[PDB]
Amino acid sequence: VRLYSCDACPHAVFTTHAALLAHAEEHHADLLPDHARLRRIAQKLNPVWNRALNARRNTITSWGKKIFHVAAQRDAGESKMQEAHRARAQLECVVRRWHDKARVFIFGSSVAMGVWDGTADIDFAVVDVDAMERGSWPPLEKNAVRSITELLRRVGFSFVNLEPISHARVPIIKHHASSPDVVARSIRFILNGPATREDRLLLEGSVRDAVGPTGVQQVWWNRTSDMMSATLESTTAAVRAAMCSPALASASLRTKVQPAHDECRPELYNIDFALSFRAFGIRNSTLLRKYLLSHPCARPGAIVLKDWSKTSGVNNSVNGYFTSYAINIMWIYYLVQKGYVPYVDPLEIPESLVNYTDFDPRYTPMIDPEITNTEREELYKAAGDMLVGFFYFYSFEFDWGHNVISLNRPGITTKRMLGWHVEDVVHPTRYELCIEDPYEENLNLGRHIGVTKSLRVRTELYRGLLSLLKE
Numbered sequence: 380v381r382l383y384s385c386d387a388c389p390h391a392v393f394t395t396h397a398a399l400l401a402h403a404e405e406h407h408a409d410l411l412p413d414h415a416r417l418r419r420i421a422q423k424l425n426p427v428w429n430r431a432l433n434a435r436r437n438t439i440t441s442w443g444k445k446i447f448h449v450a451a452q453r454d455a456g457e458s459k460m461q462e463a464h465r466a467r468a469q470l471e472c473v474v475r476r477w478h479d480k481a482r483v484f485i486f487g488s489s490v491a492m493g494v495w496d497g498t499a500d501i502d503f504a505v506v507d508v509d510a511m512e513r514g515s516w517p518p519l520e521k522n523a524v525r526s527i528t529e530l531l532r533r534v535g536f537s538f539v540n541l542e543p544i545s546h547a548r549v550p551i552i553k554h555h556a557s558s559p560d561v562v563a564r565s566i567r568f569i570l571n572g573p574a575t576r577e578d579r580l581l582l583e584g585s586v587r588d589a590v591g592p593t594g595v596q597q598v599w600w601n602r603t604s605d606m607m608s609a610t611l612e613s614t615t616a617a618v619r620a621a622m623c624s625p626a627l628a629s630a631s632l633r634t635k636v637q638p639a640h641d642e643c644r645p646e647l648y649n650i651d652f653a654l655s656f657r658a659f660g661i662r663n664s665t666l667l668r669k670y671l672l673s674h675p676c677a678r679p680g681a682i683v684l685k686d687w688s689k690t691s692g693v694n695n696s697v698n699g700y701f702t703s704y705a706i707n708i709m710w711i712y713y714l715v716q717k718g719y720v721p722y723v724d725p726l727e728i729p730e731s732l733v734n735y736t737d738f739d740p741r742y743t744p745m746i747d748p749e750i751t752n753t754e755r756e757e758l759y760k761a762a763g764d765m766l767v768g769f770f771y772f773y774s775f776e777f778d779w780g781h782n783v784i785s786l787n788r789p790g791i792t793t794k795r796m797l798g799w800h801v802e803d804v805v806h807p808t809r810y811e812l813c814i815e816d817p818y819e820e821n822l823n824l825g826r827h828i829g830v831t832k833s834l835r836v837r838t839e840l841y842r843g844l845l846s847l848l849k850e
């Protein structure tokens with residue numbers, strides 16, 4: 380016996396779960412208009428479910444083809460991924476000016492999916508691994524944000540694109556790239572006065588030291604000796620050179636530096652990114668990566684589900700629904716429980732970043748280019764069956780009432796096991812739809828999802844189930 384409070388009105392409590400459901404269904408059908416209809420329509424298929432898969436096998440397979448096509452869109456080839464790597468290296472040069480032992484870790488979808496489309500935000504993590512081991516990372520993040528911000532501004536980042544978020548729960552920097560070639564690796568130095576012969580050698584030397592033996596291709600001064608342009612070997616070398624702190628001879632002679640062109644610039648200037656100082660996202664993405672790579676159809680299905688979850692509205696964190704991260708776990712959990720992929724123990728992904736090698740997310744093509752057409756058609760069938768099974772599993776198979784979506788153990792996880800079988804009623808921590816976070820303990824990814832919210836989710840799961848059987 381326990382309390383059950385509604386989330387659609389502040390004055391409704393019951394002592395059973397069925398009553399809380401009936402309540403929402405009755406006097407809150409406006410919040411969940413299609414739940415009752417789609418459910419009834421979906422329940423008619425259940426007794427003849429295998430006959431339906433038989434009859435609609437061609438449609439299912441065609442959906443499988445569409446899944447690999449949609450997935451192929453977010454896979455822009457190894458060269459496009461390598462643009463993210465160079466941007467990562469360029470950022471590392473910048474942040475090391477602020478803290479020499481800091482390194483830049485990419486995390487997020489590029490890690491998870493092993494591809495990058497060229498548009499989706501890149502997540503940057505800035506960590507001193509040594510200090511993290513000592514338990515002294517990150518520093519005061521409000522101060523770190525303003526410091527790196529000012530470092531980026533001086534290397535040419537405009538306030539138009541650079542948004543410091545110093546006062547947030549997790550202080551970050553967000554770069555919002557604008558919408559649009561030897562000049563991309565070319566920079567200009569603006570001096571506040573004329574440079575002597577000795578001054579000019581000192582500047583060039585500071586630059587030459589910044590990039591090494593081959594780093595500089597050419598250098599030229601204007602006729603007033605107050606401007607020096609430089610062409611470096613690479614876009615990354617161009618940011619390296621721009622990060623040099625020159626010690627000139629002439630007193631009060633200072634320099635300003637920026638890319639030679641306003642639009643044609645190193646990778647970092649041209650990509651949206653979020654910069655944070657915590658390592659929480661690194662271990663996460665690595666876990667997701669290992670899972671999603673253990674099956675040829677795992678990443679295409681994940682990509683499709685993410686899009687569906689956003690369009691259907693079940694992926695919407697600002698309003699208290701699931702995140703894309705949570706959707707992946709739903710997908711992976713289903714894969715695990717139905718034997719599509721082997722169980723991965725979350726603890727078997729190292730928490731420490733000491734032995735870390737994969738700063739640059741390894742590239743893995745969305746589909747093996749060298750497979751046969753017979754094999755490719757098999758994957759289409761497989762992808763279709765798997766996506767359909769997902770919506771079937773969560774519509775009819777998974778016990779939303781008493782179980783938890785969890786990758787923390789290979790077997791069933793009950794709500795009771797996590798102590799999620801009761802709610803603290805006095806905007807509570809909801810336990811209607813439960814997804815366990817693999818590394819944050821006692822955190823439900825569905826904690827903002829009350830009963831009416833939950834039924835809206837159930838609605839969309841029914842809808843997608845019905846969708847994949849029809850042309």
Ligand SMILES: O=c1ccn([C@@H]2O[C@H](COP(=O)(O)OP(=O)(O)OP(=O)(O)O)[C@@H](O)[C@H]2O)c(=O)[nH]1
Pocket residue numbers: 486487488491502659660661663664702703704705
């Ligand atoms: O609750 C969370 C959410 C996110 N993350 C970390 O953030 C990374 C990004 O997870 P997101 O949910 O932000 O997915 P996404 O960036 O691919 O898609 P959108 O934002 O466009 O919806 C994840 O890979 C995970 O490492 C967490 O660690 N915990």
Ligand SMILES: [Mg+2]
Pocket residue numbers: none
């Ligand atoms: Mg995100």
Ligand SMILES: [Zn+2]
Pocket residue numbers: 385386387388391402407
């Ligand atoms: Zn109510």
